[PDB]
Design a protein around this nucleic acid. Structure first.
Ligand SMILES: [Mg+2]
Ligand SMILES: [Mg+2]
Ligand SMILES: [Mg+2]
Ligand SMILES: [Mg+2]
Ligand SMILES: [Mg+2]
Ligand SMILES: [Mg+2]
Ligand SMILES: [Mg+2]
Ligand SMILES: [Mg+2]
Ligand SMILES: [Mg+2]
Ligand SMILES: [Mg+2]
Ligand SMILES: [Mg+2]
Length: 127
RNA sequence: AUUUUGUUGGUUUCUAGGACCAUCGUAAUGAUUAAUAGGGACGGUCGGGGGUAUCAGUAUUCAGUUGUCAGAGGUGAAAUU
Protein backbone atom coordinates (compact mmCIF):
# COMPACT_ATOMS: atom_id res chain seq x y z
CA UNK A 1 0.00 0.00 0.00
CA UNK A 2 1.72 3.13 1.35
CA UNK A 3 5.49 3.64 1.70
CA UNK A 4 6.37 4.29 5.35
CA UNK A 5 9.17 6.28 6.87
CA UNK A 6 9.67 7.08 10.54
CA UNK A 7 9.22 10.69 11.68
CA UNK A 8 11.42 10.95 14.79
CA UNK A 9 10.30 14.24 16.35
CA UNK A 10 12.44 15.57 19.22
CA UNK A 11 10.60 18.56 20.71
CA UNK A 12 12.49 20.33 23.49
CA UNK A 13 11.71 23.74 25.01
CA UNK A 14 14.53 25.45 23.06
CA UNK A 15 14.10 23.92 19.59
CA UNK A 16 12.08 21.41 17.56
CA UNK A 17 13.60 18.61 15.49
CA UNK A 18 11.62 17.04 12.64
CA UNK A 19 13.65 14.04 11.53
CA UNK A 20 12.32 11.44 9.06
CA UNK A 21 14.28 8.22 8.55
CA UNK A 22 13.62 4.85 6.92
CA UNK A 23 12.21 1.83 8.74
CA UNK A 24 15.61 0.88 10.17
CA UNK A 25 16.44 4.46 11.16
CA UNK A 26 19.96 4.10 9.75
CA UNK A 27 19.09 6.20 6.66
CA UNK A 28 18.19 9.87 7.07
CA UNK A 29 15.75 11.29 4.52
CA UNK A 30 15.04 14.80 5.83
CA UNK A 31 16.06 16.72 8.96
CA UNK A 32 14.66 20.25 9.32
CA UNK A 33 14.85 21.98 12.69
CA UNK A 34 12.87 24.93 13.96
CA UNK A 35 16.13 26.86 14.14
CA UNK A 36 16.53 26.71 10.38
CA UNK A 37 13.27 28.62 9.95
CA UNK A 38 13.85 31.58 12.30
CA UNK A 39 16.72 33.91 13.18
CA UNK A 40 15.69 34.49 16.81
CA UNK A 41 16.73 32.01 19.48
CA UNK A 42 13.65 32.68 21.64
CA UNK A 43 11.23 31.09 19.14
CA UNK A 44 13.27 28.19 17.76
CA UNK A 45 10.77 25.97 19.61
CA UNK A 46 7.70 28.00 18.66
CA UNK A 47 4.67 26.19 17.22
CA UNK A 48 4.91 28.43 14.15
CA UNK A 49 8.53 27.42 13.47
CA UNK A 50 7.70 23.74 13.97
CA UNK A 51 4.88 23.93 11.42
CA UNK A 52 7.20 25.48 8.81
CA UNK A 53 9.85 22.89 9.68
CA UNK A 54 7.36 20.05 9.22
CA UNK A 55 6.20 21.37 5.84
CA UNK A 56 9.78 21.43 4.56
CA UNK A 57 10.19 17.90 5.90
CA UNK A 58 6.96 16.77 4.21
CA UNK A 59 7.96 18.40 0.91
CA UNK A 60 11.33 16.64 0.93
CA UNK A 61 9.62 13.33 1.74
CA UNK A 62 7.31 13.59 -1.27
CA UNK A 63 10.07 13.92 -3.88
CA UNK A 64 11.89 10.85 -2.53
CA UNK A 65 8.75 8.68 -2.50
CA UNK A 66 7.81 8.65 1.20
CA UNK A 67 4.01 8.83 1.28
CA UNK A 68 3.37 7.84 4.91
CA UNK A 69 5.27 7.99 8.20
CA UNK A 70 5.14 6.52 11.67
CA UNK A 71 5.43 9.03 14.51
CA UNK A 72 7.90 8.59 17.38
CA UNK A 73 7.58 11.74 19.48
CA UNK A 74 10.10 12.29 22.27
CA UNK A 75 10.97 14.92 24.85
CA UNK A 76 14.44 15.68 26.20
CA UNK A 77 14.13 12.87 28.73
CA UNK A 78 17.13 11.64 30.68
CA UNK A 79 17.36 13.62 33.91
CA UNK A 80 15.41 16.52 32.35
CA UNK A 81 11.71 17.01 31.61
CA UNK A 82 9.60 14.24 30.07
CA UNK A 83 6.95 16.45 28.60
CA UNK A 84 7.30 17.25 24.87
CA UNK A 85 8.00 20.78 23.74
CA UNK A 86 5.44 23.13 22.20
CA UNK A 87 6.71 22.40 18.68
CA UNK A 88 5.93 18.69 18.81
CA UNK A 89 2.19 19.29 18.55
CA UNK A 90 2.51 21.61 15.55
CA UNK A 91 4.92 19.43 13.56
CA UNK A 92 2.52 16.48 13.85
CA UNK A 93 -0.53 18.45 12.68
CA UNK A 94 1.44 20.09 9.86
CA UNK A 95 2.63 16.71 8.58
CA UNK A 96 -0.93 15.32 8.54
CA UNK A 97 -2.32 18.41 6.74
CA UNK A 98 0.39 18.34 4.04
CA UNK A 99 -0.94 15.27 2.23
CA UNK A 100 1.39 12.88 4.04
CA UNK A 101 -0.28 9.83 5.59
CA UNK A 102 0.11 8.94 9.27
CA UNK A 103 0.80 5.46 10.62
CA UNK A 104 1.56 4.43 14.21
CA UNK A 105 2.20 7.05 16.89
CA UNK A 106 4.35 6.32 19.96
CA UNK A 107 6.10 8.27 22.69
CA UNK A 108 9.74 7.19 22.83
CA UNK A 109 11.03 9.58 25.47
CA UNK A 110 14.05 8.00 27.22
CA UNK A 111 12.99 7.27 30.79
CA UNK A 112 15.47 6.18 33.49
CA UNK A 113 14.75 3.44 36.00
CA UNK A 114 16.12 6.04 38.50
CA UNK A 115 19.54 7.29 37.43
CA UNK A 116 21.94 10.26 37.40
CA UNK A 117 21.97 13.54 39.39
CA UNK A 118 20.08 16.39 37.72
CA UNK A 119 21.61 19.82 37.22
CA UNK A 120 20.51 22.80 39.32
CA UNK A 121 21.77 21.86 42.78
CA UNK A 122 19.96 20.97 45.96
CA UNK A 123 18.11 24.30 46.15
CA UNK A 124 17.11 24.37 42.49
CA UNK A 125 17.42 27.26 40.08
CA UNK A 126 16.49 30.39 42.00
CA UNK A 127 14.55 32.99 40.03
C1' A B 1 34.84 -26.17 137.56
C1' U B 2 29.85 -25.22 141.41
C1' U B 3 30.79 -28.68 146.33
C1' U B 4 34.37 -32.33 150.44
C1' U B 5 37.90 -35.80 152.27
C1' G B 6 40.59 -31.69 159.60
C1' U B 7 43.75 -29.05 155.52
C1' U B 8 47.10 -26.05 150.33
C1' G B 9 49.35 -27.47 146.20
C1' G B 10 45.72 -31.71 145.11
C1' U B 11 44.49 -36.00 141.45
C1' U B 12 41.58 -38.76 138.28
C1' U B 13 38.22 -41.68 138.92
C1' C B 14 34.07 -40.02 140.56
C1' U B 15 30.01 -37.31 140.54
C1' A B 16 26.58 -32.97 137.44
C1' G B 17 26.41 -29.26 133.38
C1' G B 18 26.23 -27.36 128.67
C1' A B 19 27.85 -28.65 123.09
C1' C B 20 27.70 -32.07 119.52
C1' C B 21 27.39 -37.15 117.56
C1' A B 22 23.92 -41.75 116.55
C1' U B 23 19.04 -44.55 117.30
C1' C B 24 13.91 -44.60 117.99
C1' G B 25 9.19 -42.26 118.38
C1' U B 26 6.05 -38.10 117.59
C1' A B 27 3.94 -34.66 112.90
C1' A B 28 -1.35 -33.27 108.30
C1' U B 29 6.57 -33.32 108.93
C1' G B 30 8.37 -28.81 105.68
C1' A B 31 8.23 -25.19 99.06
C1' U B 32 2.22 -18.77 99.05
C1' U B 33 0.20 -16.54 94.09
C1' A B 34 1.81 -16.77 88.75
C1' A B 35 0.71 -9.79 88.30
C1' U B 36 -3.73 -8.00 81.11
C1' A B 37 5.07 -6.93 85.68
C1' G B 38 8.81 -9.01 83.45
C1' G B 39 12.53 -13.01 81.35
C1' G B 40 12.84 -17.68 78.52
C1' A B 41 11.19 -21.83 75.33
C1' C B 42 7.88 -23.32 71.19
C1' G B 43 4.24 -22.26 66.33
C1' G B 44 2.70 -20.12 61.95
C1' U B 45 3.98 -15.91 60.26
C1' C B 46 5.27 -10.58 58.96
C1' G B 47 8.52 -6.63 57.43
C1' G B 48 11.74 -1.43 51.69
C1' G B 49 15.38 -4.22 59.73
C1' G B 50 20.91 -5.70 59.12
C1' G B 51 25.25 -8.18 56.72
C1' U B 52 27.70 -11.09 52.60
C1' A B 53 27.54 -12.45 47.69
C1' U B 54 24.45 -12.39 43.28
C1' C B 55 20.94 -10.84 39.13
C1' A B 56 17.94 -6.82 36.63
C1' G B 57 16.58 -2.12 34.53
C1' U B 58 16.60 1.87 31.41
C1' A B 59 18.90 6.32 31.78
C1' U B 60 23.65 9.70 31.81
C1' U B 61 28.59 10.44 29.53
C1' C B 62 32.09 8.45 26.34
C1' A B 63 33.62 5.43 22.14
C1' G B 64 32.74 2.71 17.89
C1' U B 65 30.01 1.91 13.23
C1' U B 66 26.33 4.55 10.15
C1' G B 67 23.07 8.17 7.66
C1' U B 68 22.26 13.11 5.92
C1' C B 69 23.37 18.82 6.05
C1' A B 70 23.42 24.28 8.69
C1' G B 71 23.12 25.45 12.24
C1' A B 72 23.38 23.26 17.47
C1' G B 73 23.38 24.60 22.54
C1' G B 74 21.29 27.87 26.48
C1' U B 75 17.94 31.79 28.53
C1' G B 76 13.16 36.01 30.60
C1' A B 77 16.39 37.73 26.28
C1' A B 78 21.30 36.64 25.00
C1' A B 79 26.34 35.40 25.08
C1' U B 80 30.51 32.23 26.53
C1' U B 81 30.54 27.06 23.93
MG1 LIG C 1 16.67 27.52 21.69
MG1 LIG D 1 19.49 30.73 11.52
MG1 LIG E 1 27.01 26.51 39.29
MG1 LIG F 1 10.86 32.75 42.66
MG1 LIG G 1 37.61 -28.36 153.01
MG1 LIG H 1 2.49 -13.99 84.53
MG1 LIG I 1 10.48 -17.76 65.42
MG1 LIG J 1 12.28 1.24 27.44
MG1 LIG K 1 27.44 30.56 12.00
MG1 LIG L 1 24.90 32.54 12.54
MG1 LIG M 1 19.22 26.46 19.70
Amino acid sequence: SQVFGVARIFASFNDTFVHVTDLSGKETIARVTGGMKVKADRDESSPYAAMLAAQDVAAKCKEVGITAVHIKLRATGGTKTKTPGPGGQSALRALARSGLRIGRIEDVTPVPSDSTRRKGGRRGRRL
